[PDB]
């Protein structure tokens, strides 16, 4: 957590806590193994012209309270999404990742034999 | 009573003398009033809007804290009614102590009868 990495954002602390939980659990079985990152195939040639056939849909903006009543109250400045807003925003994803990831056998052996991608 | 409606009030002839007056005989009709408030209301933009109990609690605590922070000690007066029970009055005194004020008073008591001096 922040005791090791210094001040950061909260998901960094959560990630460090989960990784340390895994390491401690391995240690409690009698064999300490350190945490290591995985190797994936990544694409860096994607540009705006390659996505020029995608239709454009505006983002679901956040409902923010007026600044006249915000300066005096400790009430919430923003509201959570409704179900219609959530569906409208989630239906806009481009599905960038491989659908075959959880059953692909190439990446299994690539990560098993530690081949650089 | 019958359910949630107060129907009449009678004297207690076993534990006391069993006499009453007009305010004790007929004065409990305000329990059946339809003009009684039901939920806390907060004034925003000059309109009272209903809130939850948690939001009301947070609002009153934070606003008293704001007054204390801006203006210091003894900037809050607690004016009670002598119709409340002893436990209510004790908790009101504790609340006056917690927000750092010594001005606890009542318009009906108005300083006592002077027999204490
Ligand atoms: C003002 C502020 C605003 C922030 N805003 C954001 C934000 O908007 N978004 C975001 O992502 N991150 C934000 N952060 C960062 C985030 O809060 C922290 O990075 C994250 O919570 C780290 O948590 P932690 O577990 O490492 O330690 P902490 O959550 O900081 O502390 C863990 C606990 O350890 C306890 N503790 C300390 N010493 C001892 C001891 N000797 N014995 C026992 N218990 C002890 C403390 O009581 C504390 O409850 C903010 C941080 C601050 C300070
Ligand atoms: S898959 Fe991820 S990066 Fe790609 S459009 Fe959806 S949310 Fe964005």
**B-chain residues near A75 (CB < 8 A):** 55, 59
Q: How open is the CA angle A78-A79-A85, to the nearest 5 degrees? A: 125
Question: Terminus-to-terminus CA distance in chain A, angstroms?
Answer: 30
CA distances from A64 to A72, A89, A102 (A): 15, 17, 40
Resolution in A: 3.0
**Phi/psi class of residue A65: alpha, beta or left (left: φ > 0; alpha: ψ in -120 to 50)?**
beta
Helix, strand, or coil here: B58?
helix
**B-chain residues near A74 (CB < 8 A):** 58-59, 62
The reply to whether residue B44 touches residue A74, judged by beta carbons under 8 angstroms, is no
**B-chain residues near A73 (CB < 8 A):** 59, 62
Task: Spell out which chain B residues touch chain A, with contact meaning CB-CB distance below 8 angstroms.
Answer: 44-45, 55, 58-59, 62
| Exposure class string for B51-68: b at 16+ Cβ within 10 A, else e | beeebeeebeeeebeeeb
Residue B16 C-alpha, separation from nearest chain A C-alpha, in angstroms: 52
Element at A68 (helix H, strand E): helix A67-70
Sign of dihedral through CA atoms A8, A9, A13, A19?
negative
Experimental technique used to determine this entry: cryo-EM
Ligand 2 pocket, Cβ-based, cut-off 6 angstroms: A 93-97
CA distances from B60 to A74, B40, B45, B73 (A): 10, 11, 17, 18
Q: Do residues A71 and A65 touch, judged by C-beta distance below 8 A?
A: no
For ligand 1, is residue A13 a contact (CB within 6 Å)?
A: yes
Distance A109 CA to ligand 2 centre (A): 26
The reply to whether residue A69 touches residue B59, judged by beta carbons under 8 angstroms, is no
For ligand 1, is residue A9 a contact (CB within 6 Å)?
A: yes
Helix, strand, or coil here: B105?
strand
**Which residues of A contribute to the annotated binding site for NADPH?**
8
């Amino acid at each position: 957590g922040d005791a090791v990495t210094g001040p950061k954002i909260a998901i960094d602390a959560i990630a460090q806590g989960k990784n340390a939980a895994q390491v401690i659990d391995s240690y409690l079985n009698g064999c300490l193994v350190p945490h290591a990152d995985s190797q994936y195939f990544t694409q860096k040639d994607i540009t705006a012209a390659d996505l020029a056939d995608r239709a454009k849909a505006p983002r679901v903006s956040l409902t923010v309270e007026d600044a006249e009543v915000r300066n005096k109250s400790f009430m919430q400045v923003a509201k959570t999404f409704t179900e219609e807003e959530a569906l409208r925003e989630s239906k806009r994803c481009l599905e960038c990742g491989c659908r075959d990831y959880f059953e692909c056998q190439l990446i299994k052996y690539i990560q098993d034999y530690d081949v650089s991608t | 009573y019958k359910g949630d409606v107060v129907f009449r009030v009678t004297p207690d002839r076993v534990n006391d003398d069993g006499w009453l007056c007009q305010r004790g005989k007929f004065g409990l009709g305000h329990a059946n009033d339809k003009a009684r408030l039901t939920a806390p209301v907060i004034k925003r933009n000059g309109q009272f809007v209903k809130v939850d109990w948690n939001e009301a609690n947070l609002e009153v605590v934070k606003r008293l804290q704001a007054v204390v922070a801006a203006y210091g000690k003894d900037s809050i007066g607690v004016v009670v009614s002598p119709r409340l029970t002893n436990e209510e009055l004790f908790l009101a005194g504790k609340l006056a102590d917690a927000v750092n004020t010594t001005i606890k008073t009542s318009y009906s008591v108005d300083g006592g009868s002077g027999l204490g001096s």
